[PDB]
Design a protein around this nucleic acid. Structure first.
Lengths: 63, 63
DNA sequence: TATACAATGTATCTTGTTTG
DNA sequence: ACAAACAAGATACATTGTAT
């Protein structure tokens, strides 16, 4: 799940929702709504996936 | 722009906004604003790149 | 026909505050 | 005071219905 997936990778690169959230150009909370399943298709999905080193598809449909 | 690239890459596929909206899993209306600059980052962007047989970056930055 | 316009609803974003 | 969450008010995008 896109929340499990973004959380697990974030922890992995060893970042925190605020730092990730700078990399993504977004905010902590925005990164939070995401990770806590409060959003599904955020505007920065593309830019999130690139901060995470994965693909917008893997992110979406775990692949 | 993305509105621009969506138009052409659909124009050359013989799909109408409506039957493109059909593959993309969306309305014609939704395909119209995008192509017509009414929306920047559509949420069906992943499936779109997939109906236009391109990559989300190409669509996005045209690069 | 095929595309566009318009309003209303809903997702997501923002900023402020909050609890661990 | 550090890090993750809650919550109201704002905009961007979607949906529906209609019209060029």
């Amino acid at each position: 799940s896109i929340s499990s997936r973004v959380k697990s990778k974030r922890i992995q690169l060893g970042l925190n929702q605020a730092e990730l959230a700078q990399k993504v150009g977004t905010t902590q909370q925005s990164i939070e709504q995401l990770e806590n399943g409060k959003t599904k298709r955020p505007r920065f999905l593309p830019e999130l996936a690139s901060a995470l080193g994965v693909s917008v598809d893997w992110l979406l449909n775990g692949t």
